[PDB]
Write a protein that binds this ligand. Structure first.
Ligand SMILES: Cc1cc2nc3c(=O)[nH]c(=O)nc-3n(C[C@H](O)[C@H](O)[C@H](O)COP(=O)(O)OP(=O)(O)OC[C@H]3O[C@@H](n4cnc5c(N)ncnc54)[C@H](O)[C@@H]3O)c2cc1C
Ligand SMILES: O=c1nc2n(C[C@@H](O)[C@H](O)[C@@H](O)CO)c3cc(O)ccc3cc-2c(=O)[nH]1
Ligand SMILES: [Cl-]
Length: 491
């Protein structure tokens, strides 16, 4: 008799889930499992806000509903996978364990340990690729055994390899449930908890809801305008747009696997077929999925990718240990409203537009404050709802000119950058209410408002909103000087 586990970690969906499909095939009982793992709650190492963790819980609640609707049940097991799984293998008479492959450092250690244990229990292990467009090992293999290090040569590689696989079909309308009266499957030990019960003190404030149903809705909303999809150009999109964000906001759903990257890609290709002037990579929407694939592919084959030291793709730079600069940045009190509004969005929504992530990451690292990208990445690791190990590392290295990108003379202005999109400062008025009534003339530079104007707007620099912590002209020149010297020490 076939008794199977479908183990969810990412891949939090029923659509495009070949793992799930294999688990159901010829099965008497299927046990859908997510292991609520203490590794992600020990705030010592690994950081997570209530925003992200509650987005996860919402996604698990949506899975529960999808499984309940098909005659089954999601089991949220508490514990370390190494010690939970041997128990349930025996208790449930498990013959097959299915899960979606992942390539992160923790995933590799965890997944090796669970395979060894599975083999000891006589349990078959089935691990299809479906978090990424392609099997990332296959790509490296086809490229002659190393990952390409530019987006251009990565794009050429995948064009030679061909289209990603189709989304797998939808799973059956009825699924075999867990067997009755299994003690590790007791409802009360296996329900989706709340953020309160997991132990978060403060409520989540983000406006984006977790789960596959929300992911599919947001995918559908995006594809209701095929000209927009066809003509999408990432660098030409507006980072100050918040009522209707200028990009898809599909990142947290792709991060958790509430949305299938292959579904998204197949949908793009349908549109591109009927729209022959469609944008091409890297700026196109397909280009965006390829950035993701690119950084996963490089990231999974490089040791210490998420660090500077011991990381072969990363420049060793003499970053300042400057806790007050980092704290001002982290706590949204740099005195540059563009920067502080974005850092407020980070902590409220857990999502900003890519170019707002550029402004704040450039400002922290190579642009003004010369703090290590690792400090920035950690702050993003806590607050981003789309926090992705490889994508966050790679973009921080890109923005600090530590890897992939070397043009350290290009520095974004914390005053001018947003102003060319949003001269009235609508974005700033949203995320920093204290500047609601400041005239647009002064909103990017409130320290240049006459004192009469500051008082009239109820926002006096130094009292209600802080003075700027640097002079951008002085800070950037110094930072460019230090970057030049670090590059010359490297050669
Ligand atoms: C300092 C810094 C840190 C970042 N950290 C993260 C992170 O932790 N997680 C994360 O998903 N993205 C990260 N990004 C990339 C990018 O900013 C987000 O993926 C994007 O803003 C998400 O919005 P969207 O879903 O509307 O993307 P769209 O423009 O709609 O693109 C669709 C999808 O493509 C992928 N994608 C888009 N841009 C990029 C990119 N530059 N690199 C890799 N993949 C991309 C994402 O999965 C995204 O959902 C970071 C960028 C910077 C500059
Ligand atoms: O299997 C789990 N995956 C969790 N993941 C999912 C993955 O990151 C996955 O476990 C691994 O593939 C990462 O190495 C989380 C992701 C977040 O962004 C935030 C919190 C979690 C928590 C968990 C968890 O408790 N259990
Ligand atoms: Cl709990």
């Amino acid at each position: 008799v076939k008794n199977s586990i479908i183990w969810f970690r990412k891949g939090l969906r029923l659509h495009d889930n070949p793992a799930l499909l294999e688990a159901c095939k010829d099965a008497k009982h299927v046990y859908p499992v997510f292991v609520l793992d203490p590794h992600f709650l020990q705030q010592s190492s690994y950081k997570v806000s209530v925003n992200r963790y509650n987005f996860l819980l919402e996604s698990l609640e949506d899975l529960q509903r999808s499984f309940q609707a098909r005659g089954s049940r999601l089991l949220v097991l508490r514990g370390k996978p190494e010690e939970v799984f041997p128990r349930v293998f025996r208790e449930w008479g498990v013959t097959q364990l299915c899960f979606e492959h992942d390539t992160e450092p923790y995933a590799k250690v965890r997944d090796a340990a669970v395979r060894r244990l599975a083999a000891e229990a006589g349990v078959e292990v089935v691990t299809p690729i479906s978090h990424t467009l392609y099997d990332t090992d296959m790509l490296v293999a086809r490229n002659g055994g190393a990952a390409p290090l530019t987006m251009q040569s990565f794009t050429k590689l995948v064009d030679r390899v061909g289209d990603p696989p189709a989304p797998a079909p939808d799973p059956p309308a009825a699924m075999p449930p867990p067997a009755e009266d299994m003690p590790s499957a007791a409802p009360a030990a296996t329900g989706v908890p709340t953020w309160q019960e997991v132990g978060f003190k403060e409520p989540p404030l983000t406006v984006f809801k977790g789960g596959e149903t929300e992911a599919l809705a947001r995918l559908e909303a995006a594809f209701q305008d095929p000209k927009w999809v066809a003509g999408f150009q990432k660098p030409d999109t507006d980072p100050s747009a918040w009522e209707k964000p200028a990009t898809t906001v599909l990142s947290p759903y792709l991060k958790f696997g509430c949305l299938s990257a292959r579904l998204f890609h197949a949908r793009l290709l349908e549109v591109y077929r009927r729209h022959p002037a469609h944008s091409q990579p890297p700026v196109s929407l397909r280009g965006q999925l390829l950035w993701r694939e690119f950084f996963y592919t490089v990231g999974s084959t490089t040791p210490n990718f998420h660090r500077m030291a011991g990381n072969p793709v990363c420049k060793q730079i003499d970053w300042d240990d400057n806790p007050e600069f980092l704290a001002a940045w982290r706590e949204a009190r740099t005195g540059f409203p563009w920067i502080d509004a974005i850092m407020t969005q980070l902590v409220t929504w857990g999502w900003m537009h890519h170019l707002a992530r550029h402004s704040v990451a450039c400002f922290l690292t190579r642009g003004d404050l010369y703090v290590s990208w690792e400090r920035g990445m950690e702050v993003f690791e806590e607050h981003l709802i789309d926090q992705d190990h490889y994508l966050n590392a790679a973009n921080w290295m890109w923005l600090s000119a530590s890897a992939f990108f070397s043009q350290y003379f290009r520095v974004y202005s914390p005053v001018v950058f947003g102003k060319k999109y949003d001269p009235e400062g609508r974005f700033i008025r949203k995320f920093l209410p204290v500047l609601k009534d400041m005239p647009a003339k002064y909103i990017y530079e409130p320290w240049t408002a006459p004192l009469e104007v500051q008082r009239k707007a109820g926002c006096v620099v130094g009292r209600d909103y802080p003075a700027p912590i640097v002079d951008h002209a002085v800070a950037s020149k110094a930072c460019i000087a230090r970057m030049a010297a670090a590059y010359r020490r490297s050669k």
